[PDB]
Design an enzyme around this catalytic site. Structure first.
Site, mmCIF file in Angstrom:
data_model
loop_
_atom_site.group_PDB
_atom_site.id
_atom_site.type_symbol
_atom_site.label_atom_id
_atom_site.label_comp_id
_atom_site.label_asym_id
_atom_site.label_seq_id
_atom_site.Cartn_x
_atom_site.Cartn_y
_atom_site.Cartn_z
ATOM 1 N N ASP A 77 -80.347 -4.492 -41.454
ATOM 2 C CA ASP A 77 -81.272 -5.583 -42.411
ATOM 3 C C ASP A 77 -81.392 -5.002 -43.686
ATOM 4 O OD1 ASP A 77 -83.421 -7.008 -43.172
ATOM 5 O OD2 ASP A 77 -84.604 -6.581 -41.892
ATOM 6 N N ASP B 75 -86.144 -1.446 -47.097
ATOM 7 C CA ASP B 75 -86.929 -1.563 -45.712
ATOM 8 C C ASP B 75 -86.699 -0.845 -44.854
ATOM 9 O OD1 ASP B 75 -88.815 -2.879 -44.347
ATOM 10 O OD2 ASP B 75 -87.551 -4.729 -43.962
HETATM 11 N N1 LIG Z 1 -78.334 -3.407 -31.609
HETATM 12 C C1 LIG Z 1 -78.369 -4.262 -32.668
HETATM 13 N N2 LIG Z 1 -79.538 -5.127 -33.017
HETATM 14 C C2 LIG Z 1 -79.453 -5.740 -34.171
HETATM 15 C C3 LIG Z 1 -78.544 -5.822 -35.026
HETATM 16 N N3 LIG Z 1 -78.700 -6.711 -36.240
HETATM 17 C C4 LIG Z 1 -79.934 -7.024 -35.786
HETATM 18 N N4 LIG Z 1 -80.477 -6.669 -34.708
HETATM 19 C C5 LIG Z 1 -81.787 -6.809 -33.945
HETATM 20 O O1 LIG Z 1 -82.079 -7.926 -34.335
HETATM 21 C C6 LIG Z 1 -83.596 -7.681 -35.012
HETATM 22 C C7 LIG Z 1 -83.936 -8.480 -36.218
HETATM 23 O O2 LIG Z 1 -82.801 -8.230 -37.404
HETATM 24 P P1 LIG Z 1 -83.313 -7.818 -38.710
HETATM 25 O O3 LIG Z 1 -81.976 -7.970 -39.563
HETATM 26 O O4 LIG Z 1 -84.042 -6.823 -38.832
HETATM 27 O O5 LIG Z 1 -83.978 -9.358 -39.234
HETATM 28 P P2 LIG Z 1 -85.515 -9.615 -39.312
HETATM 29 O O6 LIG Z 1 -86.162 -8.279 -39.899
HETATM 30 O O7 LIG Z 1 -86.293 -9.938 -37.935
HETATM 31 N N5 LIG Z 1 -85.434 -10.897 -40.520
HETATM 32 P P3 LIG Z 1 -85.457 -10.798 -42.091
HETATM 33 O O8 LIG Z 1 -84.595 -9.467 -42.330
HETATM 34 O O9 LIG Z 1 -84.807 -12.336 -42.346
HETATM 35 O O10 LIG Z 1 -87.033 -10.793 -42.593
HETATM 36 C C8 LIG Z 1 -83.549 -6.315 -35.226
HETATM 37 O O11 LIG Z 1 -84.683 -5.853 -34.922
HETATM 38 C C9 LIG Z 1 -82.839 -5.669 -33.996
HETATM 39 O O12 LIG Z 1 -83.490 -6.030 -32.612
HETATM 40 C C10 LIG Z 1 -77.227 -5.075 -35.073
HETATM 41 O O13 LIG Z 1 -76.241 -5.120 -35.760
HETATM 42 N N6 LIG Z 1 -77.280 -4.483 -33.708
HETATM 43 MG MG LIG Z 2 -85.098 -8.169 -43.416
HETATM 44 MG MG LIG Z 3 -85.788 -6.189 -40.019
#
Ligand SMILES: Nc1nc2c(ncn2[C@@H]2O[C@H](COP(=O)(O)OP(=O)(O)NP(=O)(O)O)[C@@H](O)[C@H]2O)c(=O)[nH]1
Ligand SMILES: [Mg+2]
Ligand SMILES: [Mg+2]
Ligand SMILES: [Cl-]
EC number: 2.3.1.-
Length: 298
Positions: free
Chosen positions: A212, A193
């Protein structure tokens, strides 16, 4: 807004005995998940029961494989807290600090800065794709076969009620799927992704972290270039992906582009299928509407 945060604060403190929540805010959202920033230091990703029942289990297994095996200075999530059940999953890890890559940021970078970022990306993908994946072999993904199974589900459910235009778009996609060779190449562990909203930059505009890995698995090598090749407002552009492919090396660029174009054509169907599987009419309508937009664009 206040209420979500309160419930999630309660669940965190309840499942993680000695964890104290001093602050909590929503930092992101998918359609079936929410992410929180807690104590200005931890990311907690959370989900209630969805169609993918082992969802945060796999993601956790991947972070654990990668934190053991990757040799890189690029940071990725390191899971400290996990609660996994059928009805609720929660993953918590220390927030990786930095600024998400965007088209706007990219356009302010000097040519040399752009080049170094491209090189960082290529190197990371090289290192991940080159891993011996034996120990994560349960995470195999076959995209063609998945598409065939989703097509069967369509045929069993709503296919007969679609319009001729919708049916023709689908059949025309299935014909292209059947004639292509782009699923027959190298398989490896891919992020799967890999878009610029998952890439973090440090203060010198160099790559510092990647988040992610929820969809990661052993899959076609061409998968990790789908968003780098994408021409849209959210992504940097086709030239960016092409240059990264040349730096990465030993990969057929025209096939990578064909793979991206096929995945893009699939998108509306993927949207319809998501709606069927999760009983969300809104996604079925959106995907069908998008078929008309694509058909009439030219
Ligand atoms: N700065 C920062 N932001 C993060 C981090 N982990 C997550 N985020 C924030 O949280 C959001 C969601 O995290 P993400 O892992 O992409 O999850 P998701 O895509 O919403 N959900 P899924 O992976 O279950 O479909 C990211 O777009 C980003 O804003 C990190 O380690 N650092
Ligand atoms: Mg995801
Ligand atoms: Mg994501
Ligand atoms: Cl509909």
């Amino acid at each position: 807004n206040a209420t979500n945060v309160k419930a999630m604060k309660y669940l965190i403190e309840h499942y993680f005995d000695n964890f104290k929540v001093d602050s909590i805010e929503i930092i992101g959202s998918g359609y079936d998940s929410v992410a929180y920033l807690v104590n200005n230091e931890y990311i907690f990703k959370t989900k209630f029961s969805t169609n993918k029942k082992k969802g945060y289990a796999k993601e956790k297994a991947i972070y654990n494989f990668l934190n053991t095996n990757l040799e890189t200075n690029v940071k990725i999530p390191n899971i400290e807290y996990s609660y996994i059940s059928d009805e609720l999953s929660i993953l918590g890890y220390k927030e990786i600090k930095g600024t998400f890559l965007t088209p706007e940021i990219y356009s302010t970078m000097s040519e040399e800065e752009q080049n170094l970022l491209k090189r960082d990306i290529a190197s990371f993908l090289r290192q991940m794709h080159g891993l011996d994946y034996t120990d994560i072999s349960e995470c195999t993904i076959d995209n063609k076969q998945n598409v065939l199974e989703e097509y069967i589900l369509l045929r069993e459910t709503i296919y007969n009620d679609l319009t001729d235009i919708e049916k023709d778009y689908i059949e025309s996609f299935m014909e292209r799927l059947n004639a292509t060779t782009v699923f027959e190449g190298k398989k490896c562990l891919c992020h799967n992704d890999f878009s610029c909203n998952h890439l973090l930059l440090d203060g010198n505009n160099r790559l510092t972290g990647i988040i992610d890995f929820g969809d990661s698995g052993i899959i076609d090598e061409y998968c990790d270039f789908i968003y780098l090749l994408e021409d849209s407002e959210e992504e940097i552009g086709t030239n960016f992906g092409e240059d990264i492919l040349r730096m990465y090396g030993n990969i057929d660029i025209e096939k990578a582009k064909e793979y991206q174009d096929i995945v893009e054509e699939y998108y509306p169907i993927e949207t319809i299928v998501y709606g069927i599987k999760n009983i969300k009419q809104e996604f079925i309508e959106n995907g069908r509407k998008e078929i008309y937009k694509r058909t009439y664009k030219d």
